[PDB]
A paper describes a structure:
pmcPhospholipase C-β ([name]β) enzymes cleave phosphatidylinositol 4,5-bisphosphate ( [name] ) into inositoltriphosphate ( IP3 ) and diacylglycerol ( DAG ). Their activity is controlled by G protein–coupled receptors (GPCRs) through direct interaction with G proteins. [name]βs are cytoplasmic enzymes that must access the membrane where their substrate [name] resides in the inner leaflet. They contain a catalytic core, a proximal C-terminal domain (CTD) with autoinhibitory activity, and a distal CTD with structural homology to a bin-amphiphysin-Rvs domain important for membrane binding. In this study, we demonstrate that Gβγ activates [name]β by recruiting it to the membrane where its substrate [name] resides and by orienting its active site.
We next determined the structure of [name]β3 in aqueous solution using cryo-EM. The structure, consisting of the [name]β3 catalytic core at 3.6 Å resolution, contained the PH domain, EF hands, X and Y domains, the C-terminal part of the X-Y linker, the C2 domain, and the active site with a Ca2+ ion bound. The autoinhibitory Hα2′ element in the proximal CTD was also resolved, bound to the catalytic core between the Y domain and the C2 domain, as proposed by Lyon and colleagues but not the distal CTD. We also obtained several low-resolution reconstructions with varying levels of density corresponding to the catalytic core and distal CTD with differing arrangements between the two domains. This observation suggests that the distal CTD is disordered rather than proteolyzed in our final reconstruction and that the two domains are flexible with respect to each other, as previously proposed. The catalytic core resolved by cryo-EM is very similar to the crystal structure with a Cα rmsd of 0.6 Å if the Hα2′ helix is excluded. We note that, as in the crystal structure, the autoinhibitory X–Y linker occludes the active site. We attempted to determine a structure of [name]β3 in complex with Gβγ in solution, in the presence or absence of detergent, without success.
Numbering used by the authors: 12 to 92, 97 to 470, 574 to 850, 867 to 881
Write the structure that this text describes.
């Protein structure tokens, strides 16, 4: 039921806006249009050149009172400064939550900005628009070329030369072949640059012997075409998924297989005889029908009824910072970016107020950073708590205010800002008695829970907390922190609404010492882990180390995107970006038990066996440089193999072909926790793209994988071509041993 991106009628034609820059302090009058496929937001600016904004890279559009107000008096004199409030709209785009740009537009009509903001936020955060197929990204590149015209309304050659900048001579060679004007400028009329000419230009620019090898291997030892039984047997032999059932996902019939030939083959002579040439099969391999993940993977199809303790929750740590821990600058924008990305547990370190006024502020503990006040932070959390996923957001207070007047001021702020969302009273079905589990995420849709006390040197400043008052301890009902004594002692206590906060090193000690008791603890209560205090440059531990034993709130640092943050943002993308993933069956049922450090297969869990072979790649860069591709697998410490690599291609960043043996992962013990990680690098270590695929729902056969950038935003051109084969498994000093097992996962 996930819709395709549909551009409404009032955006295809476009309205008028008054784009104002705060820096240049200027006024222009532009017209905002969205192209009919839903790819760009383009406008003809003052310099007669069409500016474009990629609509997939929009983080937030905010209008009304949340929009940016001008602080230059002369630009308010220009705009004439309360109906003038709601005619504002700002668009927030960028490649990571830190380095965001702003685009300010003021409408000229009456009540258009609300419709424009809502339609742009719907077109940006779409699910099927992000997980598209390969042909859609090629058409996205074509629409990018068709929009950006010059002052004479033609397409200059320099845009085509800046697109495929990994060569020169083949570009004008193929343009001379296809019948195009190759020159310095050449002023190409857009009528003679339709989509078929673009497809001919790409097919004569990049020759594909790999698809010729695939056509050689799938039974076309006769040259030209494919018959119905050959194409049907290719699909039903290679492209199946043998883990599923043959009665729920039925095999392909020729009556359904004729529609693919009627849809993809361009040649009318092969079509009447029901055949498929090479030019049609190459179009088939990147369509809607043959993707890398099925559409059930990203749809909100997870059973959201289980207790809250059975859910990996996307969390953050020191969300106010934007740089290193010591001398950073605190900012309120990072709360909005974290909540709009999909984080659900943010942090607040509150401090006491000054003599002359009274206000608590948020900053790091005496390391000489900046200061933001608490009211703006709570307003930003109230604004962007449910703009992306209607599911409960846990606030994590780290209180330091010792003057109870300011504590009652903070409690009154929290009550007056949020409203009905804040969980001020416990629920009817679930009381706070020893014996009853936590509520469900479905029961708390749209609510906000706080985490405060209710009446060391490595932990940072989060160990000298202050005791509560009778005002701020009313709000703490379901998630209340408590000091951790033992596992059997906190298991005989049987109070499910407790939770404990660890530091990274104490959690590593508890994981190496007694893992089964840690898993049995995590079936009932919540447990949050934050990184240590030694990390002054905002590094990240690998969160799989604590996802293995069922920790729910594994807090990370959102400012820097290393491999840990890449894995976190990649694995919480599924389940509709809701921020909640379900734990597997053997870590939330109280009768089953298993060791997380096992090395043989676990009874009652069906193992898998995966085999990945990289074939080729396309348009991976914009310069002559080599390319190599990495394949890693995270998971349980028996499954984690992150050594594999391919040989470096020579100077082919345009169509390199690798040719070696596949990478075998022949015994995956717990398959519904492993996460395959394909990544491509230039020679020397420059990052190109990566892609996170879970092993529980990856397809088999030849597929196109479209790489993403560091913050999981879809790149247009670069795309690998892999061949995977998933199948069911057919069988043929202690602390030293635990650290030896954890070495490859730590890295
Ligand atoms: Ca903190």
């Amino acid at each position: 039921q996930l819709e395709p991106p549909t551009v409404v009628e009032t955006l295809r034609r476009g309205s008028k806006f008054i784009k104002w820059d705060e820096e240049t302090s200027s006024r222009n009058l532009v017209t905002l249009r969205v192209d009919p496929n839903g790819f760009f937001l383009y406008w003809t600016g003052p310099n007669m050149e069409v500016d474009t904004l990629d609509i997939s890279s929009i983080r937030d559009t905010r209008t009304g009172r949340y929009a940016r107000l001008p602080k230059d008096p002369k630009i308010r004199e220009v705009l004439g400064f309360a109906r003038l409030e709601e005619k504002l709209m700002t668009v927030v785009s960028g490649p990571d939550p830190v380095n965001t740009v702003f685009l300010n537009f003021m409408a000229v009509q009456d009540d258009t900005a609300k419709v424009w903001s809502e339609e742009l936020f719907k077109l940006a955060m779409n699910i099927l628009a992000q997980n598209a197929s390969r042909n859609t990204f090629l058409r996205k590149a074509y629409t990018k070329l068709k929009l950006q015209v010059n002052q004479d309304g033609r397409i200059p050659v320099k845009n085509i030369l800046k697109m495929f900048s990994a060569d020169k001579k083949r570009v004008e060679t193929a343009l001379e072949s296809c019948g195009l004007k190759f020159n310095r400028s050449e002023s190409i009329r857009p009528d003679e640059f339709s989509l078929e000419i673009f497809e001919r230009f790409l097919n004569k620019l990049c020759l594909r012997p790999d698809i010729d090898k695939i056509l050689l291997e799938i039974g076309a030892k006769g040259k030209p075409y494919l018959t119905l039984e050959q194409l049907m047997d290719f699909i039903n032999q290679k492209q199946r998924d043998p883990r599923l059932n043959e009665v729920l996902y039925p095999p392909l019939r020729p009556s359904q297989a004729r529609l693919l030939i009627e849809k993809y083959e361009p040649n009318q002579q092969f079509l009447e005889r029901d055949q498929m040439s090479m030019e049609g099969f190459s179009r088939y391999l990147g369509g809607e029908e043959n993707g890398i993940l099925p559409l059930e993977a990203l749809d909100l199809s997870t059973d959201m009824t289980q207790p809250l303790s059975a859910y990996f929750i996307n969390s953050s740590h020191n969300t106010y910072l934007t740089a290193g821990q010591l001398a950073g600058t605190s900012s309120v924008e990072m709360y909005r970016q974290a909540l709009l990305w999909g984080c659900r547990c943010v942090e607040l370190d509150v401090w006491k107020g000054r003599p002359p006024e009274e206000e608590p502020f948020i900053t790091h503990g005496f390391t000489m950073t900046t200061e933001v006040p608490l009211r703006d932070v709570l307003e930003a959390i109230a604004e962007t708590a449910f703009k992306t996923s209607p599911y409960p957001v846990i606030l994590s207070f780290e209180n330091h205010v010792d003057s109870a007047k300011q504590q009652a001021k903070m409690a009154e702020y929290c009550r007056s800002i949020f409203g009905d969302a804040l969980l001020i009273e416990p629920l009817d079905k679930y009381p706070l008695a020893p014996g009853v589990p936590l509520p469900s995420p479905q029961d708390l849709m749209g609510r906000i829970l706080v985490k405060n006390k209710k009446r060391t040197t490595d932990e940072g400043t989060a160990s000298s907390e202050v005791n509560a008052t009778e005002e701020m301890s009313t709000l703490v009902n379901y998630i209340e922190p408590v000091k951790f004594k033992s596992f059997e002692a906190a298991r005989k206590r049987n109070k499910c609404f407790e939770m404990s906060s660890f530091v990274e090193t104490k959690a590593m000690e508890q994981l190496t010492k007694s893992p089964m008791e840690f898993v049995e603890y995590n079936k009932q209560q919540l447990s949050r882990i934050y990184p240590k205090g030694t990390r002054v440059d905002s590094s990240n531990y690998m969160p799989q180390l604590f996802w293995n034993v069922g920790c729910q709130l594994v807090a990370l640092n959102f400012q820097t995107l290393d491999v840990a943050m890449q894995l976190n943002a990649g694995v919480f993308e599924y389940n509709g970006r809701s921020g909640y993933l379900l734990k597997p069956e053997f870590m939330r049922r109280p009768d089953k038990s298993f060791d997380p450090f096992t090395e043989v297969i676990v009874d009652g869990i069906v193992a898998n066996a995966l085999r990945v072979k990289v074939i080729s790649g396309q348009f991976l860069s914009d310069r002559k440089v080599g390319i190599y591709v990495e394949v890693d697998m995270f998971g349980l410490p028996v499954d984690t193999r992150r050594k594999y690599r391919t040989r470096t291609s020579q100077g082919n960043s345009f169509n390199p072909v690798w040719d070696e043996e596949p990478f075998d992962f022949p015994k995956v013990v717990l398959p519904t926790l492993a996460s395959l990680r394909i990544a491509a690098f230039e020679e020397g270590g420059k990052f190109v793209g990566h892609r996170i695929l879970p092993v529980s729902a990856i397809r088999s056969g030849y597929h196109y994988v479209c790489l993403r950038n560091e913050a999981n935003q879809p790149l247009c051109l670069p795309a690998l071509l892999i061949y995977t084969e998933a199948s069911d498994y057919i069988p043929d000093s202690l602390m030293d041993q635990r650290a030896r097992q954890l070495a490859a996962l730590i890295g």
